[PDB]
Amino acid sequence: LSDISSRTLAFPSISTADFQFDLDRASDIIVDAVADILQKYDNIRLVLVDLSHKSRILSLVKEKAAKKNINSSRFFTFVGDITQLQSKGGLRCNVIANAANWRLKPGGGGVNAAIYNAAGEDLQRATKECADTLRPGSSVAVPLPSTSPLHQREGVTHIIHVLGPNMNPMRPDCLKNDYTKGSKILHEAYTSLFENFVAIVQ
Ligand SMILES: Nc1ncnc2c1ncn2[C@@H]1O[C@H](COP(=O)(O)OP(=O)(O)OC[C@H]2O[C@H](O)[C@H](O)[C@@H]2O)[C@@H](O)[C@H]1O
């Protein structure tokens, strides 16, 4: 097997800040999507990250993962900045997920701003070579050039942009609390993410 860092994905909670997706529902969906992928693929590790130790989504996911008896060597939560996992967290993760916007543009606050700021213009060049847009519930894997400061400092080799459902009425494709559709699309976003990650590993 390759090194563990090469088989580790760190991801943030998609859709639950700027996109205002309900945390209780999101946490159920995270744990179900994680359980589903770990049932299929060996030798991967998944790490849910959020910036604050008071994170409500981390607390919910921990509770639910314990109830569901998810294998805690293969999935766990971690407090940290997704762009500083090795340097500040002490945890090397080669692949990270981004909660993107549909046009795959930098900025916009949230984790998307942080990732593009850390990665620099290399990520915008590389992303434009892979895809021009995302639709909700889908993702795209982008190899991160070795010249990127994020690669040099944190060992990140790939970023997977993911577009989750949007519940925020001041953002594109707002679902107006259609959580039937919303829940399906967030399930799809996580499965798409995890499948892209597995396709990088194997
Ligand atoms: N540096 C970080 N490290 C780890 N987690 C973070 C970080 N920054 C935020 N989070 C967590 O990341 C999680 C997701 O929060 P969001 O980034 O709003 O994603 P969304 O899918 O709701 O909105 C996407 C839109 O916002 C974007 O700007 C795009 O431009 C889109 O327009 C939360 O748990 C955060 O606490």
Residue numbers in the entry: 95 to 296
Sentences reproduced from the published study:
In order to assess whether these permuted macrodomains retain important structural characteristics, we solved the X-ray crystal structures of the isolated permutated macrodomains found in Dictyostelium APL and O. sativa Q10MW4. Structural analysis of this novel macrodomain indicates it has retained the core features of this domain family, including the α-β-α sandwich fold consisting of a six-stranded β-sheet flanked by α-helices.
A BLAST database search with the macrodomain sequence of APL identifies the permuted macrodomain in a small number of other organisms, including the plants Arabidopsis thaliana and Oryza sativa. We were able to obtain the O. sativa macrodomain in a complex with ADP-ribose, further confirming that the canonical mode of interaction with ADP-ribose is also retained. Additionally, F113, which forms a binding pocket for the distal ribose unit, is absolutely conserved, and the two substrate-binding loops (loops 1 and 2) that flank the pyrophosphate of the ADP-ribose are also apparent. Moreover, several key amino acids within the ADP-ribose-binding pocket that coordinate ADP-ribose binding are conserved in this domain. Of note, the APL macrodomain in plants is fused to two other DNA repair domains, aprataxin and polynucleotide kinase domains, strongly implying that APL supports DNA repair in plants as well.
